[PDB]
Amino acid sequence: DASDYTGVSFWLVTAALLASTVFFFVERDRVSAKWKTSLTVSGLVTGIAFWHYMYMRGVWIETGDSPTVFRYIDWLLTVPLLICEFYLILAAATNVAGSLFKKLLVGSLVMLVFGYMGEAGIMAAWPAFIIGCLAWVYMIYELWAGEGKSACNTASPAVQSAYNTMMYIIIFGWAIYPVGYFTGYLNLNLIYNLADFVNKILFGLIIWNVAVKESSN
Amino acid sequence: DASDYTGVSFWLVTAALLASTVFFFVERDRVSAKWKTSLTVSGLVTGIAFWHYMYMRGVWIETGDSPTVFRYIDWLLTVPLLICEFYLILAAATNVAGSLFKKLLVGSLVMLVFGYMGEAGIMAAWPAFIIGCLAWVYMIYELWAGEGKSACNTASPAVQSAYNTMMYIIIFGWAIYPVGYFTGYLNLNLIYNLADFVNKILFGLIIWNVAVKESSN
Amino acid sequence: DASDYTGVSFWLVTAALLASTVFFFVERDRVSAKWKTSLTVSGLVTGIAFWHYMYMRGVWIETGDSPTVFRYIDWLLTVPLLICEFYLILAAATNVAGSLFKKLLVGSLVMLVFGYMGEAGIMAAWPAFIIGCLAWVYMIYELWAGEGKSACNTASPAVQSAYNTMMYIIIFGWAIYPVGYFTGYLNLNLIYNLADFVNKILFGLIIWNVAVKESSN
Amino acid sequence: DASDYTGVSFWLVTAALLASTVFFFVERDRVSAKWKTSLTVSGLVTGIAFWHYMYMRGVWIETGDSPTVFRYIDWLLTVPLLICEFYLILAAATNVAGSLFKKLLVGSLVMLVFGYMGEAGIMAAWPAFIIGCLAWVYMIYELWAGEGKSACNTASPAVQSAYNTMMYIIIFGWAIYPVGYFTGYLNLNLIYNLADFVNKILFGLIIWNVAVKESSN
Amino acid sequence: DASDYTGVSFWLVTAALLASTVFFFVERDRVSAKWKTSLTVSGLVTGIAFWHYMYMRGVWIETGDSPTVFRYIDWLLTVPLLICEFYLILAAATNVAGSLFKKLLVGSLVMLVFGYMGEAGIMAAWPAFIIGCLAWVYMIYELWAGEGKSACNTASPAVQSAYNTMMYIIIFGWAIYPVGYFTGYLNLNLIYNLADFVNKILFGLIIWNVAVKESSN
Ligand SMILES: *C/C=C(C)/C=C/C=C(C)/C=C/C1=C(C)CCCC1(C)C
Ligand SMILES: *C/C=C(C)/C=C/C=C(C)/C=C/C1=C(C)CCCC1(C)C
Ligand SMILES: *C/C=C(C)/C=C/C=C(C)/C=C/C1=C(C)CCCC1(C)C
Ligand SMILES: *C/C=C(C)/C=C/C=C(C)/C=C/C1=C(C)CCCC1(C)C
Ligand SMILES: *C/C=C(C)/C=C/C=C(C)/C=C/C1=C(C)CCCC1(C)C
């Protein structure tokens, strides 16, 4: 109807994710070869999201409920790529070793695994939340004062601005999901749909903007 | 049948939108890198429209009625991109700051939100219509004598002609929708389908024409 | 079965239209930027046809009958593009004003509208047929001795040969449809399906041939 | 099950045809503009096959039986393109008139039409088989010592090797289908599925190999 | 549910394979013409997998059980391409005859055929396993000290590193499947799904990495 505001959000975010996927896959012509992968991922991320969003919608239509499990699946598939985007832009703008890529991947996977263990009752909720937040804070530290920051200090000002915007997205927009787990273990689907709009579309648009700016200039 | 003239329009506009989407995504080869995004959007707009048009048709088949709500959804997704097209062509033809982009986006979002609030009964119909028309007139003023006009005054004559045609489209073709809300709060689906044909296909064709002309010349 | 020869034709023409759509959209790599649009349209035409052909097949399977109305819909969408192809090849080979484009579009639309009015009983059959044939003959005259002929006289011999072949297609292959209306207002689906094979696939292949020849040479 | 070996073949050939279609449409980047069409066709052929293969599978699932009629439809669509491939490679490697294209098209169409007339009982089986085999042998002669051979004698050794391999495919792999008609008018679906694997995938791979070799060298 | 861990894996691997297919087909822009085919295959492999994975999921939903037979079908289609990847990278980096390609293809086909004969009871399980493992070991030897190793010794260090990583993947990740047949003839679906994740996605990513590195450098 006009009062649930959940199915509607579902449709809005689904169409926006489809459009973002097509946009990121099409706008690789405006960027150099070094930024193509970055854009490819931005597109894959949004495409995976859409795919899973579709299934969340089918399950919601059949028996309305939370797709948390599926939302751990998509997350399992998309959060690693979103955290790799930092390594991709650093590799396209300067010299980065790849140990940053490995440690970011490990941190994101550990965070998601412990979050799911807390969600399904396999592990105690408070320790699982603590370990997930520790992995999240470790990723934040690696992007703030670690290998990522050291590699970013040797990049152009446009790349540095994009890196700062992406880091602030990781700090604040990603903070919604741990706030949800906290609240749920102590509406949600609508908040998660909107969260994605920024986390997946605005993130990719920041990457696309810096890539197009660098390739033109 | 042959007398409703509504489902038929639905099929006509749906096929035209599909064709326009493919055309805009394919004809990016004829334009320079500066115009590619403009064409990408023209394609995304028409594509989103088609997508939502499909759902409007399924809902009409199941239980015939107005898709207003969905038509606020697609609009919510397409009107910002259509109003961004001005910024995109100005950026591809001359130097434009981006404050124009921000203010156009804010104005379009405010207009659509107040229109929906008037449509759903959340807010009083007359104040909602007044605020929506004020946002529309503010966008018209920004394109007529504001930052958009100032940026257009430093462009080539072909870009100026395209900008004037797009502005007149915004003034007149977009005027149909507030006329509908007025009439409905004081046939409609057919008028809205035809409205789109011009607002979404002719708009994109004007953009495509100016982009191809500039890229060849 | 093996005796209707109608559903079979439907499948043959549907697959041929799909293959032609893919061929035209793919073979734009072999042509210069000036001919890309021409090929894009040839592809869109065939694609729209396929789309509508699909629906004609669904309706025929559900309740076998004539899709005339839908066949006025697709025609409404494809005949303008087919007649525009003349303007597109003239623009890609020489200087043509565009008044030719406008007058061809108006003539084709008037012809189709009056044909539908005669088909649905809105207007008297004989006057509607007379007006439609007058619009058709006016288009033929414009292509034979008018602005189209004047623009074609200043083109390369290959473009002139393609223009003559397309004009003879317009004269003879398009003559089937008025012969059908005459016969029906004084088998048909099979004749219309075959008609399309030449009108839509051979037309586009003539355009593709001249475009590839000019781009290579 | 695991003993029919027909539905399984169907799945194997369907997936292989899909993969070949994608491969041929994608690998046009490795070839020059002169070979693009050749690859386009190789792709269209496999794509049409897949399309029709799908329907053959739906009909087999609904009421298991021979899709001969449909197999005359696809053949009607694909055999002309496969026999045109000779003209396409000769045109991309040397000067060929096009009378070869016309006579190959006529011969293939006559062969298929008489084969279907013999299959449906419209014409006597033995005369229809004789006329079809005469058309097939005429095509073989035109490729062996006719205009095709004359054009091939003025080509590079790689093109000559590809032409010889394609001609031997026409002689031997195509010989399965007349052997089937003979046997059936005096298992089969499995033999026809495998036949296609070579006739449609190996043929296109020979064309792709020679095109890539010539374009690189 | 949340305890089967099989259907979930199915969804995870299906989405990952789709994403990998799109990634490998899209990232051909970053590589030279010599590596395009390599990437094309990496994409086709993953694509075919996805396709078959879909059907495995439909069969599992309808009547839950092992898709071994279908898993011999996809394997029949994908293992040859995966083993051809060695020849493709060797051809894109140095001079390789093609006898390596032929012998690898024959070995993979023999291995799969004997494995299926052991699985279906056509041939005795122990002799079929012995012959399949002999073919596998022959392929390993050809890649370790045969024509493949001889061709790899004359390649750049990056290509040699990629070749070594792919060879170790063949040695260890491919060892899961014979270990399954052993265990089943003396959980499995989950192990096979994960096996694929590495065998099909990591293999293609190694190829993509070396191709992009060589093309940029
Ligand atoms: C597109 C989806 C995104 C970006 C999801 C991000 C999710 C997280 C950052 C989740 C984090 C969690 C913790 C930090 C600890 C508690 C459990 C989680 C999984 C909710
Ligand atoms: C493709 C759809 C388009 C371009 C839709 C445009 C819609 C508008 C300009 C709607 C405007 C309205 C007002 C100005 C005030 C009253 C309420 C609205 C939302 C109908
Ligand atoms: C792909 C479809 C094509 C090219 C259709 C062409 C249709 C016409 C040229 C129809 C012409 C008619 C008249 C000239 C007068 C009588 C009514 C019509 C609409 C049948
Ligand atoms: C992909 C399908 C192909 C290449 C089919 C080829 C079919 C033929 C060469 C059929 C030939 C026949 C004759 C030569 C005479 C008897 C009847 C036919 C149609 C079976
Ligand atoms: C994507 C699928 C892949 C890479 C599958 C690989 C499968 C094998 C290497 C199977 C090997 C077998 C033997 C070596 C002997 C016993 C039977 C088989 C077929 C299980």
Numbering used by the authors:
A (entry chain A), B (entry chain B), C (entry chain C), D (entry chain D), E (entry chain E): 25 to 210, 219 to 249
Copied sentences from the primary study:
Microbial ion-pumping rhodopsins (MRs) are extensively studied retinal-binding membrane proteins. The green-light absorbing proteorhodopsin (GPR) was originally discovered in marine γ-proteobacteria as the first bacterial rhodopsin and as an example of a new type of bacterial phototrophy. GPR possesses an N-terminal signal sequence, akin to numerous membrane proteins, that is hypothesised to guide the correct insertion of the protein into the plasma membrane before subsequent proteolytic removal.
No corresponding densities were found in the pentameric GPR map. No density for the N-terminal signal peptides could be found, presumably due to significant flexibility and a lack of interactions. In both the GPR-A18L pentamer and hexamer, the same two interaction areas are observed, comprising a large hydrophobic patch running along the membrane-embedded region and a polar interaction network towards the intracellular end. While most interactions involve the same residues, the hexameric GPR interface is slightly larger due to the closer proximity of the protomers and the narrower angle of encounter. This results in a larger surface area of 950 Å2 compared to 790 Å2 in the pentamer, excluding interfaces involving the signal peptide.
